[PDB]
Structure 1
Amino acid sequence: ETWRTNFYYNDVFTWSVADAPGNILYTVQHSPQNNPFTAVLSQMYAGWAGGMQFRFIVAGSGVFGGRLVAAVIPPGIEIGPGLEVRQFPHVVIDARSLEPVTITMPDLRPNMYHPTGNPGLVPTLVLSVYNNLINPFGGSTSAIQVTVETRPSEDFEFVMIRAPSSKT
């Protein structure tokens, strides 16, 4: 299936020099709505399970400095300013990265599947500043953009086909 072999655009956010280390820049809950094609397919099924892959593309240059840290937070843990992302299993993203950086969010769940419309407890992916962005030139450029892309994992699947006009 071609809809699960390629990465597709999901979202975009901004990283600036003002952001102090430890600040959270981007959070998203695990859901089929985070992919363009799973959102279409979800209207004819009553449940889902499996993980998803995320890919980050940094639109920086070779003169910038600074790093970001991304990690997956298990269900049942409060998300806020006092979260130590750097002490979870994580990956490191550079400002002058030329190749995309990929992190997989597995389906960490206490149930067997997520009902559509009420998935229950789900994991969360959190992006935060590890080292603050620096611009040695000090000109008019004080921020850069990061693009997010997603692709379903190998074990992702739908269950319990249903009528398209039904209500969850």
Structure 2
Amino acid sequence: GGPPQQVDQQETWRTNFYYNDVFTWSVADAPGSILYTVQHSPQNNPFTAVLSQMYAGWAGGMQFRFAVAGSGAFGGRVAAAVIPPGIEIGPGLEVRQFPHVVIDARSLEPVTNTMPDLRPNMYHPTGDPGLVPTLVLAVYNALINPFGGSTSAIQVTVETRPSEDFEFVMIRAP
């Protein structure tokens, strides 16, 4: 591999969180189900996406932040774990024994989970990255609404940020 090419962190991007995706959390979800399966790719942050268009190859982790738009009178948690590569993702993947964080439905402050680059190589090529970690937001205790009515489908907004070790390795035609 080559030298790092996104050094000098203080550059707005990689120091601030930007929107990645939004997923809905339902009351009728079974408490072991899987929502928001995402893969370690540079197509999560848009500035990271356009510099991955610029560069050939990337390395380093990505910092994920979850903001829940739910009322204070809600219950149930979400479990977020960084699944190792090589482990099959699907039904029966029990998430709660991985190193995980707990995200409340009535959480005022956003919960941040660091997703490192668990890779056998130095870098992931842009055309074919190879073995990459997977971030899984499995439910930990289902949503409970003690009211009854139309409000049963609150949603969580995922915010993303490159970490301190994220950097591109080789430049190419943008």
Return the TM-score normalized by structure 1: 0.96
Q: Residues of 2 paired with 1:139 and 1:119: CA distance?
A: 46
Q: Residues of 2 paired with 1:42 and 1:140: CA distance?
A: 42
Alignment of 1:46-85 (within 5 A): 46-85=56-95
Q: Residues of 1 paired with 2:105 and 2:164: CA distance?
A: 30
Structure 1 gaps of 5+ residues are none
Q: Residues of 2 paired with 1:73 and 1:47: CA distance?
A: 22
The count of residues paired between Structure 1 and Structure 2 equals 164
Shift of 1:151: 0.5
Render the CA deviation track for 1:46-78: whole Å, top value 9, x for unaligned: 110000000000000111111110100111000
Render the CA deviation track for 1:111-151: whole Å, top value 9, x for unaligned: 11111110001000001111010010112211101000001
Q: Residues of 1 paired with 2:103 and 2:53: CA distance?
A: 35
Render the CA deviation track for 1:3-56: whole Å, top value 9, x for unaligned: 121100110000011001100011100011010101011112111000000000
Which of 41, 50, 56 is residue 51 of structure 2 equivalent to? Answer: 41
Shift of 1:163: 2.2
Render the CA deviation track for 1:71-126: whole Å, top value 9, x for unaligned: 00111000011111001110001010000000000000011111111000100000
| Counterpart secondary structure, 1:114 | coil
Return the TM-score normalized by structure 2: 0.92
- What RMSD in Å do the two structures reach over aligned CA positions? 0.7
Q: Residues of 2 paired with 1:162 and 1:65: CA distance?
A: 49
Q: Residues of 2 paired with 1:110 and 1:150: CA distance?
A: 23
Q: In proportion to residue count, which structure has more strand?
A: 1
